[PDB]
Scaffold this active site. Sequence first.
Site, PDB file in Angstrom:
ATOM      1  N   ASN A 159       1.744  -5.902   2.551  1.00 17.38           N
ATOM      2  CA  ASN A 159       1.718  -5.583   1.806  1.00 17.38           C
ATOM      3  C   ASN A 159       0.815  -3.856   2.057  1.00 17.38           C
ATOM      4  O   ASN A 159      -0.499  -4.030   2.378  1.00 17.38           O
ATOM      5  CB  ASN A 159       0.907  -5.714   0.598  1.00 17.38           C
ATOM      6  N   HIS A 192       0.602  -7.414  -9.120  1.00 20.09           N
ATOM      7  CA  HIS A 192      -0.728  -7.254  -8.085  1.00 20.09           C
ATOM      8  C   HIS A 192      -1.354  -7.185  -9.217  1.00 20.09           C
ATOM      9  O   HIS A 192      -2.117  -6.218 -10.169  1.00 20.09           O
ATOM     10  CB  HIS A 192      -0.360  -6.006  -6.569  1.00 20.09           C
ATOM     11  N   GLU A 211      -4.304  -5.161  -8.053  1.00 24.28           N
ATOM     12  CA  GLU A 211      -5.010  -4.229  -8.450  1.00 24.28           C
ATOM     13  C   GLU A 211      -4.368  -3.153  -9.374  1.00 24.28           C
ATOM     14  O   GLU A 211      -5.167  -2.374 -10.281  1.00 24.28           O
ATOM     15  CB  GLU A 211      -4.971  -3.164  -7.100  1.00 24.28           C
TER      16      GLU A 211
END
Lengths: 242, 242, 238, 238
Positions: A8, A94, A96
């Site tokens: 990632n 994710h 974030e």
Amino acid sequence: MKYLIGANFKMYKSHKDLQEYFDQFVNNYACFVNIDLMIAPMTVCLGTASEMTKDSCVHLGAQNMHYEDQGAYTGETSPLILKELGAEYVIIGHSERRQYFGETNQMINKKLKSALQHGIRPILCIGENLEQKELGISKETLKIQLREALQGIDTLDQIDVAYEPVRAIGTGKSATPEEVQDIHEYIRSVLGNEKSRIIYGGSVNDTNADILIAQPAVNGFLIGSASLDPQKFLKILDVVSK
Amino acid sequence: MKYLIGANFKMYKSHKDLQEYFDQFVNNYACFVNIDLMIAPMTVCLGTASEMTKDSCVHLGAQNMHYEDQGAYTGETSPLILKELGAEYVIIGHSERRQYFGETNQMINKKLKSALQHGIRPILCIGENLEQKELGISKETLKIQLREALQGIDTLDQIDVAYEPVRAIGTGKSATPEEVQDIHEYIRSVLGNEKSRIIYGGSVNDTNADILIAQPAVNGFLIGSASLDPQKFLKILDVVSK
Amino acid sequence: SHMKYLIGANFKMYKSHKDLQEYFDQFVNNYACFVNIDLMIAPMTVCLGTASEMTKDSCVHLGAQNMHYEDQGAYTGETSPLILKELGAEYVIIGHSERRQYFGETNQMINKKLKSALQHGIRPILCIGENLEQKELGISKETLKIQLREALQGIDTLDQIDVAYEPVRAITPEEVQDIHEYIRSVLGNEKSRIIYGGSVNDTNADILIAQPAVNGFLIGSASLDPQKFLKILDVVSK
Amino acid sequence: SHMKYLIGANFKMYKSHKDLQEYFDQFVNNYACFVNIDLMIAPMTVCLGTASEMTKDSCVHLGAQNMHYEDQGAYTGETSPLILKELGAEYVIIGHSERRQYFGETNQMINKKLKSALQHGIRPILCIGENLEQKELGISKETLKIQLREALQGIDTLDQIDVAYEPVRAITPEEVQDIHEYIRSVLGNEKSRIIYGGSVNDTNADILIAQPAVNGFLIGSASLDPQKFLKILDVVSK
């Protein structure tokens, strides 16, 4: 079941950085038979990455994706385009995206459904924060994230999961290997499926990848920062191939 | 001051749709001396668009952008990459980002600052909804959006603004031309600047573009749906060139 | 002259039952009941029964510091406007900044509360106010118009509603007048009282009340002392 | 036997001052003060003064339906725990589902309220409960553990706190036992009472109370009738 090890990149690498990464990487990766290797570059660079994974054992992954095929979603990325570029994985939910950009479990649920409709293998990210662990609600936090995410989906075996513990403080070890095993076992139970890969997206690097991948419930990694240095990421892949 | 007329494709067009658009468009657009022409494709397609605007009077625009150069922002787009591709405009704070994806005025403020640091001409989107208009707080809504967005920025003349009234119901006329003029005058007052373009991103099409662009405070358009048909978008550009 | 000034004490979460007794005794027996002034005291909701007993057969109007918009029902911890009416409450403070930040008053809730208070003949005091960032940005007035318009939608008789303006800040007279004059234009009538909820002591009650758009005060901690609240009212009394 | 059952009436936003008088008269003079039962009545906050007058020199424990976590201060519309203590309140309902949805109880606020109630010797009743989507998904227990853990952090004596479990739904006994037994494990002591706040009438109070993890009830609208609340307590009394 093959190991799934994903890079990632997050929001990293100019076009020149990405080219120099793929040169260093594709000239040296052994295409290990038992590893599904996925690289997820910055979305604006997926076209360029696409031309470098098209002739490679590397699988193109995307960092995010909308749930609609097309429409009035300024700044969003359509699954139709990821399919066009040969993206075979998509990172969904994710931490974030949850923290910064309004990613909800309900939208994650639509994204996983879309990814399966289009035959993109979604990687669902779950993870508790430090406080949730200290309160002793790690597994409970994950079950809710998983159940609201996976609701109404009949065939979970087409979904992979990254356990990504959320940690505002760095540690280099956001969980102990035994803890990861226990968490992954739990997740496997909720998943009700032996084909999903459950990959550890906590702090993974070249000095712990061996004891981590050794755990039988650890089906691979989703690596962030460590995957940006091509040499370090190759050292980790070597460890995984034993 | 040149007119600024932008095409906001939003999440539309496969790679083949985009190629056929640019062929129809770049073989027929006259590159009018008094129009800044901007096209903003889906972010995952900006690399391809980049190769079609590099030899064109068309200016590449992006639909969104992070405020950091690089970092742990899964699924985000770095300004460094937009600079690499020749993006000269960025759409910031579009109503769809505010409604769906956690776009705040504080983050918009960082994005405009970053866009100016990197010499990307940001297009700040503002707009009241139907209820705010019915309550008679249209101008007041816009002033708050503008002041919280523009706070701490010394040189506003490098910023363009799209007045994009938010309307859950379609009308084909989300405001009357006199209303647009009045709003644009107000915005111009808040902006304290005669160089910023204030462009109408309400419902613009080929049957009203003339009476709209005729208004002296209307410095161009930010067109969504109508810009997806190359012929319709050319008809509008013809009207603008009078 | 078409107007009575409104001067209210918001005790907030202060005073025991005994402090409240010492206050009303010392107050009711010594306050001159000025004809130009609507005098309002808003003690803690749990002390409203005591307070009403002490102000029946008195000129002090009783106020509540908050209320719910339904008459009855499954609203654990809420105060019914019917109980306020039976107790003789004539005022209710709606949308105080403290409720907005801490306990989720939305403009939508505030709106139903003002509609409820009007249906029951309780006169509401809508609290509006900008924070320091909004004044520093220069959007104080636009901020208040949003609060007022969202709070007042569908209410046809704005004259039934008073407004308390208080800048929201952590714990000038012409600037007050300017703000109040703007609020008056948003209200679109003269009968509503626009009372100031910022700093009001005895040094400045007179200068502040003299402004044509300042129709009184909503007094916080300064009102907790009966002698001080009396000295303020006397200065207002000129 | 180490345990007294807790049976509470949450009147919510119901009853005038006169209905409250008719209730307590008919209740206090006819309720047998069972030694095994802590009996709790929680009327509207504005009627707590009346209610306490009627239950001094009685076995009925007074409860408040909500309170604030500070003793005094700038909290317009809030109820101080000091006033509750002076009034003789022994219980407080914290975190009722109605407050969570409507009036912004967060788990962080609930936590400060439980710490406050404990510092003042008011026994709190923490309200937890899953909604229908969370039971349909199958995460009822995980949902409650989150609520409990977030509400109880840093509190060293959980035995001082009771819990009311009520499924959150729009307006089975073994399933209750299963849930309560799980809540007991989260609490990590036996002294806390886990009372059921779902449907409790006379047909089922006995079957429900007999479950070892069901330590009583929090009764809503059914408790508004004194005769019905008395019939429930008698069934519990076996």
